[PDB]
Amino acid sequence: DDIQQLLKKINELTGIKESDTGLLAADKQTLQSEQPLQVARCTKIINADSEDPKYIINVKQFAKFVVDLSDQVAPTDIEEGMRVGVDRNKYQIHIPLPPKIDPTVTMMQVEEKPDVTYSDVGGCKEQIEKLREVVETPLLHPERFVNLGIEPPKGVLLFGPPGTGKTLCARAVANRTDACFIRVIGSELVQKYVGEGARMVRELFEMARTKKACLIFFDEIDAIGGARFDDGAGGDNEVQRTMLELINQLDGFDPRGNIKVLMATNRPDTLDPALMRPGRLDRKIEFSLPDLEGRTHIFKIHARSMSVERDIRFELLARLCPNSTGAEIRSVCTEAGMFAIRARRKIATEKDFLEAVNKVIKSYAKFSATPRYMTYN
Amino acid sequence: LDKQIKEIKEVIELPVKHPELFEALGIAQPKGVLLYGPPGTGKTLLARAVAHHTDCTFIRVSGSELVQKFIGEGARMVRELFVMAREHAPSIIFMDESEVQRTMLELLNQLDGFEATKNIKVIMATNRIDILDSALLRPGRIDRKIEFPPPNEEARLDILKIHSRKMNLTRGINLRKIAELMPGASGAEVKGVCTEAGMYALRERRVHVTQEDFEMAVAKVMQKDSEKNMSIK
């Protein structure tokens, strides 16, 4: 109780301290001019007329306004189908407005480069090769394709078991793309308003068209309504419209033109048939569980950073992993280091990995990995 | 159901009235009640009676799922109900159903015991305990699982007297025999015997209920079902 009193006394002391403690030219001349300065609400012109132009503008939700040009403007500068700013009080186009950037679509563009080389991805040479000629070689050297008169697929679908490396390869392509890479946020495409997301998909293609040669990565295609049950309830009707808008813009009545689309799905079966149909996505690069040479290579790349005895045999460790995804092989390397940290040995040994191989695969409830059955030897 | 009432009083009335006794004991107050009866007789009467004699806010949430991810509202059935119970610190919530899985999980996280103020006692009163999820049945979420048995011959007499209080029973009526005549009654059935017997008098245009009227009513309330040649086994 005395110890509790000491804390209460400490709180009382803090209360005494708090009570005792209690006991640019922009903000100058410019403000006087700024308050009178008038506003000009943005609006979009749809048409123009002879003699008095009488340009009629839809504000954005208000009305079609027949507004004459403002006195201090050039009639030629105001143009049909051009965003403009109209003062509410003077009801005239005081100043024209530059075209809307639509920043949310601009945000999805990667802009930065992920620092992953193709070297880090391992055990999938064939999958890398297939991606190289739909992503890097057609863009880097189109002449070879033209010589055989063969068009590039212009579309790729990466599908495989989870943790295989589909996205890891995609970030590697982004590192050396030498062309705009547009990662797409799947949730962003779904929107509260009906078909608001569909409008965004048109913008996505429009942005892609403006840039010359760009690759769009629709990771998690299932998020972008990648199914078309389209039942009578039509709960997914808004998303289904968004999916169809992507399909038409992707191909039909003039397709991507210079856009290569990379789509990655853990479950390929769920994807809607129209998207799966080629032309929209000509290549079907499925990633697969790595073979023993691949399993050794993934172990070597993951363990190169870790400090370990030089005599460790990755081939034995890979053999002990019968069907392991790349992520699980990475999990063995990290777990092996954690066991060495637990015993406080700075340099790990082969035994540490074997304990990890049991922990990452056998210890997990795989059941097949842990054997209690004598059955087979 | 006097023993059952006392257990209900221990879980709800005792912690709220005397928090210090629990602190002195060193035991955390019980926060869960489940009332389950195969007939289920008396489970609401206890919950409604607790509601009259409570001295605490009583919230009744026997409704199903209209909110959550339906076009309705979000987290109304569970997150909102607990927040309202927080505003009134002495609060008891009576649930009459395990509903849609996401909602049931939200009830479990609210009932886990993050309520430092607590003072929230849930008198869940649903029959068919077997169907109920083990996580809901887990003792921390529901401390007590009181069982309401079909009324015993003594109990049936007591229920018969309670529902015969206003009836003008003629002298010579044997209430004890009438309880014996209906075995394994559902209690509500004992209430039924009185209502049907009174109607026999009403059709006869008399307010004087008689022993025969109770006996005839016992037969009318009682229901018997049989099938023939399916008596294999």
Binding site: N11, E12, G15, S19, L24, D27, L31, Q35, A40, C42, Q61, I95, I101, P103, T104, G163, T167, G186, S187, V190, Q191, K192, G197, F217, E220, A227, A233, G235, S305, M306, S307, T325, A327, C333, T334, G337, K346, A348 | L25, G26, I27, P30, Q68, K69, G74, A75, Q101, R102, E106, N109, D112, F114, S134, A135, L137, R138, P139, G140, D143, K145
Partner: protein
Amino acid sequence: LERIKDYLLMEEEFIRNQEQKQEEERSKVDDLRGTPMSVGTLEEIIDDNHAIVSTSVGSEHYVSILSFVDKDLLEPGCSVLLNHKVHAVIGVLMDDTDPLVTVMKVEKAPQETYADIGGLDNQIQEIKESVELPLTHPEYYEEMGIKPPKGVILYGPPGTGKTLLAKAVANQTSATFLRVVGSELIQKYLGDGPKLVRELFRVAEEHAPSIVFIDEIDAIGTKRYDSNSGGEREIQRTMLELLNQLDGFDSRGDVKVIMATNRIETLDPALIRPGRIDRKIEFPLPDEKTKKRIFQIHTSRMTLADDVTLDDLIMAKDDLSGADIKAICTEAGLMALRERRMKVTNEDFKKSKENVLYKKQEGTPEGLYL
């Protein structure tokens, strides 16, 4: 009667929290700012200082900015504050996250350290190496070359106290702890719910070291089954956004995820994979030694008769959970109070176990058969 001092400490703490302009420069800004200021998105930036600002009414008029403290913070997607009438950008953009995200952040953990938990020591070791140890001693992981495991799943039968480990982590964590149920993403509006998952993660990155607890993850992500009837849960889209945040392009920075499920088989394979849950922790029903520590901890702060045999209750009955042990201890105290004895006899504990375990009926004729 030392309670009065403790109550005073709590009241004093609340008072302390309750007790937690320039002569000309501030007054000029006060005049410049409107009595009501409306906050709206910034759509376009123009060098003249008149920048297009989007609003709920959509008036995007270019508006001058005169911010005394700084006007260089303007960015696309920033929520600028504008005068109700003039609509000019008043000054530094408002910087507050969405309200639903604010509720998750937890500053006070009721439970103490791992001391209350008993017999889950192996489970404690795993949570510490993934959560507490990397922050306390970052050098060890770098020297090994290992990158610390960032994700953990706690899976166990009901009442194994998986949540208790999470409460213990909250008690001793440098990282801000965001406690979000998996069932707290029921947003009715199409969209919004996957966006809320993005919001929780962006806040975690803003708070730098952070621990995310998602109790009852079964609701947010299970199976990833097809639409079937065509109702379309949209929950699968929400889970996919969480899957994207944990390991879907970019990086997770320094955010650690703890997730708890009564049933782990139902959870979809992609979510429960290395890279989203590097370490997996299993809580088994307590055995005998684990039961002894739990029984002692629950009865530590109560009157105990010499007659009571803690070992007898633990050995005689096998199957009771850690929560069940606490319930037996609370029930035993109530059993004694019925006899008006504050002290608890061995008889009370024996009666208590029977009352708590009446709903648990298991097994069929599997006795003579094997």
